[PDB]
Amino acid sequence: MSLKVNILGHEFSNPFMNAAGVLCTTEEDLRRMTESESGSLIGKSCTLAPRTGNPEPRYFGLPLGSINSMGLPNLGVDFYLSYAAQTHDYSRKPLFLSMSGLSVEESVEMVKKLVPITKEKGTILELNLSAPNVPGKPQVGYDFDTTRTYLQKVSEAYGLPFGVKMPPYFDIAHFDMAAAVLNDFPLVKFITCVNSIGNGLVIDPANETVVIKPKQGFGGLGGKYVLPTALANVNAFFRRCPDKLVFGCGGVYSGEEAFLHILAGASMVQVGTALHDEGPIIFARLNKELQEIMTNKGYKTLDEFRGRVKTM
Amino acid sequence: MSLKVNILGHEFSNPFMNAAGVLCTTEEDLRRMTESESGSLIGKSCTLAPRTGNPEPRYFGLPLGSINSMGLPNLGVDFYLSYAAQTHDYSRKPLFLSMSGLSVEESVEMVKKLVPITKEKGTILELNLSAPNVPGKPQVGYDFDTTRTYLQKVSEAYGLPFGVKMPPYFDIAHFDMAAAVLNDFPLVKFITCVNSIGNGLVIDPANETVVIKPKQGFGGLGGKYVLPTALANVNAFFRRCPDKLVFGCGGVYSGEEAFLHILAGASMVQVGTALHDEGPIIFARLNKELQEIMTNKGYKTLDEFRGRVKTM
Ligand SMILES: Cc1cc2nc3c(=O)[nH]c(=O)nc-3n(C[C@H](O)[C@H](O)[C@H](O)COP(=O)(O)O)c2cc1C
Ligand SMILES: Cc1cc2nc3c(=O)[nH]c(=O)nc-3n(C[C@H](O)[C@H](O)[C@H](O)COP(=O)(O)O)c2cc1C
Ligand SMILES: O=C(O)/C=C/C(=O)O
Ligand SMILES: O=C(O)/C=C/C(=O)O
């Protein structure tokens, strides 16, 4: 029995990694992820210059998940590049970096810096097209013309295989249009589905007040709220983008949800809210739980059921 | 103390009504809603000719809500017009009709028939711009150019105050764009936020199969999944559309959620999944619970706290 995943010319011990933004901002964060049982890890979505992000409170834990408006707090691209170039232990696991420049110009400058590091070390890029908590910046993934520009310029500047973190879509026509754009860019080798359900609003009945400070209380929703949306997006892109991998993100708290993501088409499974709650010990637990389910089903490898969800 | 809502010249005993699609397809259904403690009721979203809808199974109750791909099963516009003109007891409560033509031309034909009945009986129109379960038809509300055509043509053909049932939005830019369209049509007097979270996917880990037959398992999500999205949309349009009422729909299981919708800016509060689960007796419970909360906080009327959510 094996949880191994072989993608992007790399071997992964298991399909699990952190979702970007969770346990991946500081060197301590990245060390802890690297020391974890996780199959991989990804750095915080970064910008050219550092950011401290939005004012507090900017995160609120909920019964059914989380709401956040972090605002892309990050140590700046130079920090993540230096981690990838000289700190990270690649013998432990592969490393992804999320890049989230707030303009095509910023992104282009950033991805150009990664090229030598990718060539030397094998560091993988995930382009963030779904930043929902920066005031005045729309989610790029909801604008297909802007998305096309980013993919074009990054394809030219970076010129190596990379992935995209997509916002959740809720309409068949949008699946179609998103896939049509993604399928024009052969360097896009994986799609991460999905980012937070953007711009939700939580109000505390007791004090009649929103629970987070930025953007009048509007923030991205994670956790149990997003599982059906995540599964749909994973499966939709899995079918529409056969020449690309899909990474599953959203609602993973146990082996059962991981199993569902993989059945829907996920190669890798990312863990956000649950990891924030439980810390890196979750990855040991997820490995155990997924193996239990596989044992019960009489499956030896992930390839026995990846993308094999049955319809009626 | 008073749960009363006074809008469009009508007195509503309370703000509660069924969401379109739940307990409102047949005469029996409509009778039970009229006999219930609800402040109002809305007829099933209808088409010019009858529809039987999607194949079974097309509805699945979930721990956290519901998934459905009903496909607009309805008795045709003549049935609902006839109910509105001949059968409905207006002394019990006002009646809304939802109209969901699958083309602007179909919509125009339908609303023209309603004009004489609205003038004589006071029947209120809700235009469905968010049907997510018709194979091959995108949700109109996600196309601002198409939405503009529907509102133009319906405004001209109907010529009387009406409302729109909007899909949920997840980006600030979409709130802005949607509002910019709605604010160009003075006859649009209310906005219902929100329809189902479209095109989610539920898989049963036990049999590795989707739980609904149509569209490879993809259906609209309702219930606890949609509360924060609903509150966000209600609040976003409450602030952006001062010349219009906002009706809340999504995640209402109790007086507490109803209170939150109203605090966010809702005039009327619609109940879908919870009503399907519990039956029309729910309205008696919702009235009681909302009254208790208002008593506890010292509010004598909904007007004292409608749209008065506090931010930091
Ligand atoms: C505190 C926090 C910070 C996040 N930061 C990022 C980020 O920097 N980049 C990104 O692409 N997604 C970010 N996300 C979204 C997650 O990567 C993930 O898509 C989302 O939380 C859904 O997964 P979950 O249900 O496991 O939480 C963040 C989420 C949280 C809760
Ligand atoms: C079985 C079912 C049928 C529905 N039919 C319609 C419909 O015909 N027209 C419509 O505008 N919305 C329809 N909806 C959406 C609901 O009106 C409502 O917006 C959604 O369920 C979210 O509210 P909830 O969280 O209370 O379920 C339907 C939902 C369900 C569950
Ligand atoms: O840092 C945040 O605000 C979230 C980023 C994201 O979801 O991409
Ligand atoms: O009848 C349905 O499938 C759904 C209707 C709606 O969501 O508007």
- For residues A267 and A212, the answer to whether their CB atoms sit within 8 Å is no
Residue B63 has a CB neighbour count (10 Å cut-off) of 7
- What is the distance between the alpha carbons of residues A309 and B189, in angstroms, rounded to a whole number? 45
Which ligand gives the minimal distance to the CA of B97? 2
Angstroms from A59 CA to nearest CA on chain B: 14
Q: What is the DSSP letter of A73?
A: -
Suggest the residue from B175, B233, B312 to mutate for an interface test with chain A (most A CBs closer than 10 A).
B312
* Among the listed residues A241, A251, A233, the one whose alpha carbon sits nearest the alpha carbon of residue A172: A233
Nearest to B201 among A203, A215, A232 (CB): A232
- What is the distance between the alpha carbons of residues A210 and A200, in angstroms, rounded to a whole number? 11
Residues from chain B that touch A198, judged by Cβ atoms under 8 A, are 170-171
Q: Looking at chain B, which residue has its C-alpha nearest residue A310?
A: B209
* Among the listed residues B217, B66, B55, B59, the one whose alpha carbon sits nearest the alpha carbon of residue A265: B217
Structure token pair of residue A279 = 């810390």
Is B260 within 8 Å of A216 when comparing Cβ atoms? no
For residue A252, which phi and psi values (nearest 5 degrees)? -85, 115
Is A138 within 8 Å of B173 when comparing Cβ atoms? yes
- What is the distance between the alpha carbons of residues B66 and B210, in angstroms, rounded to a whole number? 14
Distance A199 CA to ligand 3 centre (A): 11
- What is the distance between the alpha carbons of residues A214 and A70, in angstroms, rounded to a whole number? 9
Experimental method, per PDB record: X-ray
Is A228 within 8 Å of B221 when comparing Cβ atoms? yes
- What is the distance between the alpha carbons of residues B22 and B275, in angstroms, rounded to a whole number? 7
Residue A271 near ligand 1, beta carbon < 6 Å: yes
Pocket of ligand 2, beta carbon within 6 A: B 19-22, 44-45, 59, 66, 68, 70, 72, 98, 128, 165, 195-196, 222-223, 226, 249-252, 271-274, 276
Which ligand gives the minimal distance to the CA of A131? 3
For residue A192, which phi and psi values (nearest 5 degrees)? -95, 120
Is B57 within 8 Å of A312 when comparing Cβ atoms? yes
Q: What type of residue is B271?
A: V
- What is the distance between the alpha carbons of residues A161 and A189, in angstroms, rounded to a whole number? 6
With the most atoms of ligand 4 within 8 angstroms of its CB, the residue from B44, B150, B195 to mutate is B195
Structure token pair of residue A7 = 């993608």
- What is the distance between the alpha carbons of residues A54 and A57, in angstroms, rounded to a whole number? 9
Pocket of ligand 3, beta carbon within 6 A: A 21, 45, 69-72, 128, 130-133, 195-196, 220
- What is the distance between the alpha carbons of residues A250 and A227, in angstroms, rounded to a whole number? 5
Distance A130 CA to ligand 3 centre (A): 7
Residues from chain B that touch A296, judged by Cβ atoms under 8 A, are none
Neighbouring C-alpha atoms within 13 Å toward the C-beta of A187 = 18
- What is the distance between the alpha carbons of residues B43 and B256, in angstroms, rounded to a whole number? 26
* Among the listed residues B242, B276, B234, B225, the one whose alpha carbon sits nearest the alpha carbon of residue B258: B234
Atom of ligand 1 lying closest to residue A194 CA: 19
Nearest CA residue ID for atom 5, ligand 2: B21
Angstroms from B309 CA to nearest CA on chain A: 6
Residue B133 near ligand 4, beta carbon < 6 Å: yes
* Among the listed residues B24, B73, B70, B68, the one whose alpha carbon sits nearest the alpha carbon of residue B51: B73
Suggest the residue from A170, A235, A246, A289 to mutate for an interface test with chain B (most B CBs closer than 10 A).
A170
Q: What type of residue is B152?
A: Q
Nearest to B199 among A171, A256, A264 (CB): A171
Which ligand gives the minimal distance to the CA of B68? 2
Angstroms from A135 CA to nearest CA on chain B: 9
Residue located via tokens 């863990």: A271
Is A199 within 8 Å of B171 when comparing Cβ atoms? yes
- What is the distance between the alpha carbons of residues A123 and A194, in angstroms, rounded to a whole number? 22
Deposited resolution, Å: 2.0
Q: What is the DSSP letter of A310?
A: B
Structure token pair of residue A44 = 């915080």
Distance A254 CA to ligand 1 centre (A): 17
- What is the distance between the alpha carbons of residues A171 and B219, in angstroms, rounded to a whole number? 10
Distance B29 CA to ligand 1 centre (A): 43
Distance B43 CA to ligand 2 centre (A): 12
Phi-psi region of B72 (alpha: psi -120 to 50; beta: other; left: phi over 0): left
Is A263 within 8 Å of B203 when comparing Cβ atoms? yes
Is B170 within 8 Å of A205 when comparing Cβ atoms? no
Q: Please say whether the dihedral angle defined by the alpha carbons of residues A292, A297, A301 and A307, taken in this order, is positive or negative.
A: negative
Is A200 within 8 Å of B231 when comparing Cβ atoms? yes
What is the bridge-based pairing of β-strands A197-201 and B59-62?
unpaired
Is A213 within 8 Å of B312 when comparing Cβ atoms? yes
Domains of chain A: 5-54+72-196+224-304 (3.20.20.70)
Structure token pair of residue B161 = 């105050």
Is A200 within 8 Å of B228 when comparing Cβ atoms? yes
B63's CB contacts (< 8 A; 6+ apart) are none
Angstroms from A117 CA to nearest CA on chain B: 34
Distance B141 CA to ligand 2 centre (A): 15
For residue B276, which phi and psi values (nearest 5 degrees)? -60, -40
Structure token pair of residue B41 = 């009721």
Torsion of CA B225, B229, B234, B238, to 10 degrees: 170
Angstroms from A69 CA to nearest CA on chain B: 13
Three-state secondary structure of chain B: CCCCEEECCEEECCCEEECCCCCCCCHHHHHHHHHCCCCCEEEEEECCCCECCCCCCCEEEECCEEEECCCCCECCHHHHHHHHHHHCCCCCCCEEEEECCCCHHHHHHHHHHHHHHHHHHCCEEEEECCCCCCCCCCCHHHCHHHHHHHHHHHHHHHCCCEEEECCCCCCHHHHHHHHHHHCCCCCEEEEEECCCEEEEECEECCCCEECCCHHHHEEEEEEHHHHHHHHHHHHHHHHHCCCCEEEEECCCCCHHHHHHHHHHCEEEEEECHHHHHHCCCHHHHHHHHHHHHHHHHCCCCHHHCCCCCECC
Nearest to B197 among A170, A311, A312 (CB): A170
Beta strand extents in chain A (DSSP E only): 5-7, 10-12, 16-18, 41-46, 59-62, 65-68, 95-99, 124-128, 162-165, 188-193, 197-201, 203-204, 209-210, 218-223, 245-249, 266-271
Is A311 within 8 Å of B216 when comparing Cβ atoms? yes
Residue located via tokens 């779904």: A130
